[PDB]
């Protein structure tokens, strides 16, 4: 595919989730610059407010199209349109918490639509997630490669916690395009930095931003 | 609590799930002998038939009330009524597949009602689960203990596959009672044996059975 | 093989180890009843005394011959003589500690000789292992099966700590016989209970005991 | 400490190891440019030749001093002299193989001396490691942070195998300086690229090279 994605795109998102039994719905309205690998979004909790867990666990669920890919690495994501692609992710936290997030991404006009599901279980009640002790995800480098023919990104993630300590989470995301004839990339990397730019007291309203750049390491 | 659960009880269940993008709904009608630790259930796929993955990954999601507890070990489950209890489980397969299952169990008359959710992601497309190469779960021994005050069961599970080889899965289930004043047990074990007694060609109809016995090891 | 192992056997052992940089040597003199699955041993720290870490992490390194096997399950271990067998084990603790233990077991007369190596790394300095806060390993059930043709035992292990909490460790042991024509068992279980019967203040002298019984579950 | 490490340094190394029961000794003679983050080494198998497993599993055991650190990130390694530092590492492969590597690094004149130990267990006999099917480690990005006060590096590593597929290994290295008053860095990254430049048929003689650069991501 010869991508027709534009330098400026809009984003609409709906997330339905359940973490440690707490049900919630979050709506997102955003935009981004696909070729610059930058995007931002306004998130609003529509059901389940106020959330009783760390908002940070949800943020990476709020689209690799927004990553700056150099010409020498096939861009699986920008090639995946007009039909779109979906992804599945496991988030395994070091204290036993486990989450699964999925997103089905489609395109209508210049807007990407995202149908997101997020489920989390086994978080210790007095742990940093249920006690809202997280400050941010540190920047990261995602390792992209094919597993049984499916593009997969593995990441060593870490949440900085109050008290200046880290809490590790291992990510595995599988990406599946619905577009025919996509050229698959070889082993590569995608640097990321996700940030909550601002938020209200209970995180009912959050401004999120991500910068991502693909590269060949070394 | 002084349990009023009877020697014969009925079971009603509804599971909504999504594995590797495949959505499905399964209804269960069963019964069991709580004090003998035995139960059986008739399962029918109501939506999403025929399932494109190994039915076995779902079976343990289809109630520890059905486990023979000796008098010297507090029975967290039989004490959890009339209000009921819920559980959350992570299933981590050795080839990357990850599932989360949850069940909210309630009681009406002599019938346990089960609201079950099952989500699975990252299964390799040519793996034993997506290729339906499983034969059964082997019997197991669940290790029960408290983690940050929450009763937790960890298990070394294994699926026997065609070709006489095994496929490992690690289970962690957290159990949370809604009943006040429940007496918590110390570290103990629960032996299990779950079996599909019979099924039709595509597993649209399955007869399931479980035998479970709690003990103190040694 | 038709085992000539006797109902009463002796044991000689030498362990060379290094945990978090601390080098040590421990000698063991013991005995056991192979067909009853019971054994005991006197252990003496010969170098590296006093150990600065929890002695309990070492104890399972101090022979599955000492397990009561029923007639219907092939006994890989009692069949492994006179040539002997060796085993390798990874111990993965939940806070990042990782140990590898190995033992080459031989037989001379009525005495099993054990050449043991134990290495442990990445234990947090203020963790329960380096701070000697363990009380005992809980009893366990080892799941025995073949992995790529090699007998393997996976176990959900747990150390009881001071303060009435548990610290999890996952075990994987691979067993390899040097005896020709050994009949391999199918999937089965081995219940264990290991205990330090008594010890001096710094654990320079320890009396250890293990009871183990193989079975088919259910 | 105000580092006196020079732009050109020499390296002497001795590794004693045992993988899946195979004992070996390898000697290394090399050199590097600490401030450029580049080093190379000539490795010779002195005992245990020819190795029956993939040489690649050993290569990262053959010193973070050789990493280009920018001025804004404290360099734990170049500050660790003249007394030196040591490190411990767990290598957890996706098919069950587990290795532990350790290195005690000292300095005499302009030469770093390395006392290395490498132990590996539980590798499937027909797996890529025991069958020598690896081609190289892909480049990587190590995530550096403090865990219970100890500098730790976690990495998502991957070995490229014959047949154009990847084999994952998770690394955790803990670094411990013997030098007093070292300024600890905050969360950061170290990009790496390790390569076998050339080797003889059985890998008895190997020319190894590494390029590494520390950065703050984004
Ligand atoms: Ni084209
Ligand atoms: Ni804030
Ligand atoms: Ni009472
Ligand atoms: Ni059948
Ligand atoms: Ni015979
Ligand atoms: Ni004592
Ligand atoms: Ni200074
Ligand atoms: Ni070559």
Model description:
The PDB classes it as luminescent protein. The entry lists the keywords beta barrel, luminescent protein. It forms a tetrameric assembly. The structure is a homotetramer of 218-residue chains. With 218 residues, chain A is mostly beta strands. The first copy, chain A, has a single domain (1-218), classed as Green Fluorescent Protein, CATH 2.40.155. Chain A contains no helices and twelve strands. Chain A has strands at 9-19, 22-33, 38-47, 85-93, 98-108, 111-121, 134-137, 140-147, 150-161, 165-177, 188-199, 205-215. An eleven-stranded mixed beta barrel of chain A has the order 1-2-3-12-11-8-9-10-4-5-6. Chain A is globular and about 50 Å long. The A-B interface holds A 18, 20-21, 86, 88-90, 92, 96, 98-100, 102, 117, 119-122, 124-127, 147-150, 152, 172, 174, 176 and B 18, 20-21, 86, 88-90, 92, 96, 98-100, 102, 117, 119-122, 124-127, 147-150, 152, 172, 174, 176.
What is the total number of structural domains of chain A? 1
Tell the overall outline of chain A: globular
Which class of chain A in CATH terms? Answer: Mainly Beta
The count of helical stretches of chain A stands at 0
According to CATH, the fold-level topology of chain A is Green Fluorescent Protein
Order of helical and strand elements of chain A: EEEEEEEEEEEE
Question: Helix coverage percent of residues of chain A?
Answer: under 10%
Name the strands of the widest sheet of chain A in spatial order: 1-2-3-12-11-8-9-10-4-5-6
Largest interface: A-B, 30 and 30 residues
Structural class of chain A: mainly beta
Tally of DSSP β-strands of chain A: 12
PDB class: luminescent protein
Keywords: beta barrel, luminescent protein
Assembly: tetrameric
Entry title: Crystal structure of stony coral fluorescent protein Kaede, green form
């Amino acid at each position: 595919p010869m991508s027709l994605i534009k330098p400026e795109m809009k984003i609409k998102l709906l997330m339905e989730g359940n973490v440690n039994g707490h049900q919630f719905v979050i709506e997102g309205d955003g935009k981004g610059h696909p070729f610059e690998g930058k995007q931002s979004m306004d998130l609003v909790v529509k059901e389940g407010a106020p959330l009783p867990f760390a908002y940070d666990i949800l943020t990476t669920a709020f689209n690799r199209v927004f990553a700056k890919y150099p010409d020498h690495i096939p861009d699986y994501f920008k090639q995946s349109f007009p039909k779109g692609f979906s992804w599945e992710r496991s988030l395994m936290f070091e204290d036993g918490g486990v989450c699964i997030a999925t997103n089905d991404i489609t395109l209508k006009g210049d807007t990407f639509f995202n149908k997101v599901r997020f489920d989390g279980v086994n978080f210790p009640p007095n742990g940093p997630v249920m006690q809202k002790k997280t400050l941010k995800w540190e920047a990261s480098t995602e390792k992209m490669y094919l597993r049984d023919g499916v593009l997969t990104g593995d990441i060593t993630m870490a949440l900085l916690l109050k008290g200046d300590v880290h809490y590790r989470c291992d990510f595995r995301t599988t990406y599946k395009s619905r577009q025919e004839g996509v050229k698959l990339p070889g082993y590569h990397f995608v640097d990321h930095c996700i940030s909550i730019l601002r938020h209200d007291k209970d995180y009912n309203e959050v401004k999120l931003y991500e910068h991502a750049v693909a590269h060949s390491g070394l």
